[PDB]
């Protein structure tokens, strides 16, 4: 029961970012710290999930084969909107046979100069928005990203990267099953690229964290 933690995404003026960490856990044990959890689908789309890794692998292998074959056999390249619809009907069908896909997905892409971002949960609920998250990202990160999207005009790429890193910083401080090693995917100009892993800067040296002040008996 290898499992992945949080995923977060946000739209900016010209594209969309998706981020998560490179870790799979088994219960509390941090078992594999060097796992690429984001998967490219066709020409325009990337996906990630929180929860059971085996179910993420089965579902994404199946969708990737359908997309490559439909193109090879003469039925065109599926868009992010169509891929998302297809994913959601598969998750709902499995829920309806009492054999659920125990993951929560985030999907991002770019097609037609128009960015896409959406989530699907394990009973088949679906939504699209300017920011989306799964796992603890839904409690920790959405509040920060929703405040950054309040400014009128939208975010630049640089502002979007900066607020994404503040979110990853808080997940590392406050989510138990996490490591400080993340990747960012960028969908813009009708393609997706995945960056190299990086780490964020953290603060541990406040006066209020010192040995004397935190002592229980004085």
């Amino acid at each position: 029961m290898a499992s992945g933690g949080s995923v977060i995404g946000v739209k900016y003026n010209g594209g969309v970012l998706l981020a998560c960490d490179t870790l799979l856990s088994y219960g509390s044990l941090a078992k594999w710290p060097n796992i690429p959890r984001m998967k490219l689908v066709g020409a325009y789309t990337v996906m990630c999930a929180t929860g059971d890794y085996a179910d993420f692998q089965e579902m994404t292998t199946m969708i990737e084969n359908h997309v490559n074959r439909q193109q090879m056999y003469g039925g065109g390249a599926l868009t992010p909107n169509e891929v998302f619809c297809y994913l959601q009907r598969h998750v709902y069908h499995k829920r309806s046979q009492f054999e659920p896909c125990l993951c929560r997905f985030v999907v991002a892409g770019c097609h037609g100069g128009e960015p896409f971002l959406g989530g699907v949960d394990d009973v088949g609920t679906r939504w699209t928005d300017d920011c989306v998250a799964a796992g603890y990202g839904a409690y920790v990160a959405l509040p920060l990203l929703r405040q950054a999207l309040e400014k009128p005009g939208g975010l630049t790429r640089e502002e979007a990267i900066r607020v994404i890193k503040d979110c990853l910083r808080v997940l590392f401080y406050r989510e138990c099953r996490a490591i400080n090693k993340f990747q960012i995917a960028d969908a813009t100009s009708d393609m997706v690229s995945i960056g190299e892993p990086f780490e964020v800067e953290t603060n541990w040296e406040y006066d209020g964290f010192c040995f004397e002040k935190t002592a229980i008996i004085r």
Binding site: N65, R69, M72, Y73
Partner: protein, 227 residues
């Protein structure tokens, strides 16, 4: 002469006449040629047009069956299309179950097996097509032919259909160890322009495809400028 009404009966001499008759449909169809270079494989076929008002790409005889492999049909096209579907399913099975691209020799033997089974049972007839299979997986470049009997063989160069006797003569004056995929397209197209009979079939065009290093072992139609 009741012995030639179904494929489930031998004749006194040890023949199966329904299968021979199905082969006669291939021998009366349009010509195809193919060649195996050191880089890859090239296939070309003549399309007889039935109207001057067709769109381009209509009644295509060449079809991809995986990233690295393709098929060309001779004889009856709708029969060929049923074999193309089967082949697509075998290539997918190999990726999904065994995690490999199907080797060329294995793909050809499954296509043969499938065609043979329609020569055994009173309720079905044999296919009226021969299939050229062209592949470049981990077993190198490979070219095979399967006919209506289900017989399968490997070739360096091959011709099928009504121009085949002459076309074979001209493929024997090629050097198979040395030739590249850009030379091949010029020679193969020449053979097909020369055997075309201008009295019987007035309108025609050529269709050409390849899989090679230049293309990254991807099977595809050649760009229409190279003819």
């Amino acid at each position: 002469t009741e012995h030639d009404q179904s494929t489930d009966i031998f004749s006194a001499d040890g023949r199966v006449f329904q299968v021979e008759y199905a082969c006669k449909a291939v021998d009366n169809g349009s010509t195809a040629v193919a060649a195996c270079c050191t880089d890859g494989v090239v296939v070309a076929v003549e399309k007889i047009l039935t109207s001057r008002m067709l769109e381009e790409g209509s009644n295509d005889r060449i079809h991809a069956v995986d990233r690295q492999a393709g098929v060309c049909i001779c004889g009856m096209l709708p029969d060929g299309r049923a074999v193309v579907s089967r082949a697509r399913a075998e290539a997918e099975n190999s990726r999904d179950v065994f995690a490999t691209p199907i080797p060329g020799s294995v793909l050809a033997s499954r296509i043969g097996e499938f065609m043979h089974v329609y020569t055994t049972h009173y309720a079905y007839r044999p296919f009226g097509c021969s299939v050229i299979i062209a592949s470049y997986a981990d077993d190198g470049p490979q070219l095979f032919v399967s006919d209506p009997s289900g017989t399968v063989a490997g070739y360096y160069g091959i011709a099928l259909g009504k121009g085949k006797t002459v076309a074979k003569t001209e493929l024997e004056k090629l050097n198979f160890k040395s030739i590249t995929c850009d030379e091949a397209v010029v020679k193969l197209t020449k053979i097909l322009h020369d055997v075309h009979d201008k009295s019987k079939d007035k309108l025609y065009e050529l269709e050409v495809a390849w899989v090679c290093n230049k293309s990254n072992c991807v099977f595809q139609h050649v760009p229409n400028d190279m003819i």
